From a paper:
In the case of CtMnmE·GppCp, the crystallographic asymmetric unit contained three protomers (chains A, B, C). Molecules B and C form a dimer within the asymmetric unit, while protomer A forms a dimer with its crystallographic symmetry mate. No density is found for the G domain of molecule C, but crystals applied on an SDS-page confirmed an intact protein (unpublished data). Thus two dimeric structures of CtMnmE·GppCp were analyzed, i.e., the dimer generated by protomer A and a symmetry related chain A (termed “dimer A”) and the dimer generated by protomer B and a second protomer B docked onto chain C (termed “dimer B”). Crystal contacts of G domains A and B in the CtMnmE·GppCp structure comprise areas of 845 Å2 and 987 Å2, respectively. Docking the G domain of molecule B (or A) into the asymmetric unit of the CtMnmE·GppCp structure to the position expected for the G domain of molecule C would create a much smaller hypothetical crystal contact area of only 18 Å2 (or 131 Å2). Thus we would expect that the G domain of molecule C is present in the crystal but, due to its high mobility and absence of sufficient crystal contacts, is not visible in the electron density map. In the crystal structure of CtMnmE·GppCp this loop region is not resolved underlining its high flexibility. In the crystal structure of GppCp-bound MnmE the G domains are found in the open state, indicating that this equilibrium is shifted towards the open state under the crystallization conditions. Moreover, for CtMnmE we find different orientations between the GDP- and GppCp-bound structures and even between different molecules in one asymmetric unit of CtMnmE·GppCp.
Residue numbers in the entry:
A (entry chain A), B (entry chain A): 4 to 251, 270 to 284, 305 to 396, 401 to 473
Write the structure that this text describes.
Amino acid sequence: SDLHLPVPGHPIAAIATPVGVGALAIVRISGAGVLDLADRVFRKVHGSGKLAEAAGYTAHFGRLYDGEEMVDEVIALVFRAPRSFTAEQMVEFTCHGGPVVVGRVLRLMLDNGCRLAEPGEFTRRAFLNGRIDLLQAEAIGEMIHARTESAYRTAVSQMKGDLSVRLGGLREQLIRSCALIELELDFSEEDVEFQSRDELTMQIETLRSEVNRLIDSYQHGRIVSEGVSTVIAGKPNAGKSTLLNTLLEECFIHDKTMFRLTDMKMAEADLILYLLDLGTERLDDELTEIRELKAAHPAAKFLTVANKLDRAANADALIRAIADGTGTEVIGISALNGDGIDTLKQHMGDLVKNLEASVLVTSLRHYEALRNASDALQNALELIAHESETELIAFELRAALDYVGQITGKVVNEEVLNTIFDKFCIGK
Amino acid sequence: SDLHLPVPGHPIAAIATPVGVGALAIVRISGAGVLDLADRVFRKVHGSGKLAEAAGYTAHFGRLYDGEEMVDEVIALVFRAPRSFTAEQMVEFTCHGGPVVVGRVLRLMLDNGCRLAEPGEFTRRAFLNGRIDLLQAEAIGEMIHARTESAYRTAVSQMKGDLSVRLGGLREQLIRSCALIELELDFSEEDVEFQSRDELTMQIETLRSEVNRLIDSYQHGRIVSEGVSTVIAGKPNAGKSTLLNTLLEECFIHDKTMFRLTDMKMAEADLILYLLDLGTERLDDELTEIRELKAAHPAAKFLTVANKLDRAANADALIRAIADGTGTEVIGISALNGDGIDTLKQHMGDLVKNLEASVLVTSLRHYEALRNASDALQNALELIAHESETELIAFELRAALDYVGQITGKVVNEEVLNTIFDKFCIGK
Ligand SMILES: Nc1nc2c(ncn2[C@@H]2O[C@H](COP(=O)(O)OP(=O)(O)CP(=O)(O)O)[C@@H](O)[C@H]2O)c(=O)[nH]1
Ligand SMILES: Nc1nc2c(ncn2[C@@H]2O[C@H](COP(=O)(O)OP(=O)(O)CP(=O)(O)O)[C@@H](O)[C@H]2O)c(=O)[nH]1
Ligand SMILES: [Mg+2]
Ligand SMILES: [Mg+2]
């Protein structure tokens, strides 16, 4: 008396809650005959309402047993048909939040038939069984690892599938535009007035500024996703390490904007901070060195940071000097002393303000595939203006559509799937 | 159509799962009209099966809303009458395991009527409403924070209430022994043969070796609970910091035995490690200094650790020398080099093996109250041998019983309750 559920994978197990101490922790398992396996270690307190023959979304209070030995007191939640995260049947034992206990709970599952889950495997299965699309599966991981109000908020928008509905809108627009020329190529004498060429050139143009708008989102969305890549550059003993350490590879947040610190990825960095040992630099007229870097990366925002302000006497004349002979803005700093750092950050968070309500695109795969989508759309657009064969024009619209589908996983790669889900923590 | 449930406290909220990133996290709330409050932020997906009118141990899939804004997609578990951790009605929203998300979920509960839970408040309420006794409430916290197989296993035994049944056994034995003399003090002429004095002296003696056995458990159980307090002592520049750091206040585990490292708590320390700069010590015949410390703490195990074995040439003759002129065992070590540390630990874990199946007592409150219990039992025991008034004898048995009850919370203190539950993490 059952339906057409997706064939479930081998039973897997992992700890779903963070590592550390806490009141509670979750170990979750999913796959084929998972609750039958759970039944063999879980003892319901009262009678013996078998876990396997239980309804979906029902909690059960009891104990996990390793034969004679008690493991913990747990609540066991039963997920049923397609109605669960992985769309296969799963059970999540929520238990006492101790490393030793939770670890011992995991091994009980492993020793009893579960293979340990692989990075992202849970979320992957969600995508693979069609409960989630590749965008939403990306959004889940992004929401967990998010470090900003904006980062979190964007993940929510995407996990809802705001981008996804926006794309399915273009998907069906391309399908409509695609099938117009594919009717011109059935032909044989089929000229039914109501022109094909004019009606389509616009259909492509509507779809192009549609896609181009989304391409511009990345400009901003990248900063939302992974912050502002900032490089601290200087000299031997300018105080780079001491600045990096007091500010917190690893990174900090300030005024709801994330900053990615690092130490070669100089080119392609949004903000360059040049640190010099104020006065104490043995050869000081190396503000040519700081002028050259500013001239070497015009794409970046630049700030000169005069460090060790506490060792230096009259600093106002030295700051003004450096500012003059480089044509940059200079901020006075003491890195070990932590002096005026809050001035530095208030300045740091200023070109990171870039030139409204609308859907964003995070990290470049979506971006890159949207570019190719645009190119093909514009190849097709130009191809009409040059009066070329329908075969070639319809063949670009196919390419465009294939790229758009690429981002929602419509066209699977299973190597793209890996570079995505390898970043995922073991347990979804 | 309801029962006699304990009056529930003000609605509280806290994050129940560890801090960090993970697939899932739990925010839990408990108190008066908690699910009514939950109903005001949680939207069930399908129709509108109100959370308040739902059955116990039933999960509900939906979304948390902050008015118009979505907060997360959650499963909401409903706990009902006395059937929950705190015995009051509670709900645990299990949601996406991101710091930003989980944090935003907590504030939604707080902004909607919940006061933030206090350290241990959840487990305290468990005890206060009588679902758990003070021993079991102690065991819960101990199981979470445990760092050893033994530590964890002992917590399980106690959370079951193994000690608790063992005590309730003495509780009713004292009640029986207490009421025997209290019948002698009703008297007026009541000498009903079947002697009172002989039958009771043994009843006290049975109960005394009963209690004394448990007092001896602490000797061992303390080491199980908080490991072996080990002090690394030396000289200016003997390499104490470098040894401490490579070995890992904070502490390490080795061969299923926990070691508590530290740097005055010299007296009352199980293991003393004396570290000296092998050879390089400017005045070396300061092995008198190391002999004096061994003679100053005979209660401890002692090991001399000859550090910086890598700088020193012929070390075997220097080690043998130090070993001779101090009467201690000497282990050769290089702290930065990490050389023969595994030999040191194999030696460290040797007097930490102390002179079988039976119930243990962890940290001294139980220990101390069991001492007083024994004293009073033995005061009463001696008092019979000295033929003193029944009033005085019955008054010691009362004192004994009161001490035994003290450990299971039978006699509340609410300042003892604080020093216990202040150690607890916010959220049980
Ligand atoms: N007075 C003062 N001294 C500083 C300050 N910052 C660093 N120093 C001194 O200068 C040294 C700089 O060390 P560090 O912070 O590692 O600078 P660095 O540029 O990373 C060294 P490298 O070029 O090798 O990476 C420190 O050892 C410290 O004594 C400061 O803000 N004020
Ligand atoms: N060759 C060698 N040198 C060491 C070793 N351990 C420490 N040193 C050297 O001796 C110094 C000892 O520093 P430290 O480890 O802090 O010893 P300490 O006894 O804690 C210093 P204090 O007495 O001030 O606490 C180090 O700076 C290091 O250069 C070792 O195992 N081998
Ligand atoms: Mg450095
Ligand atoms: Mg030191």
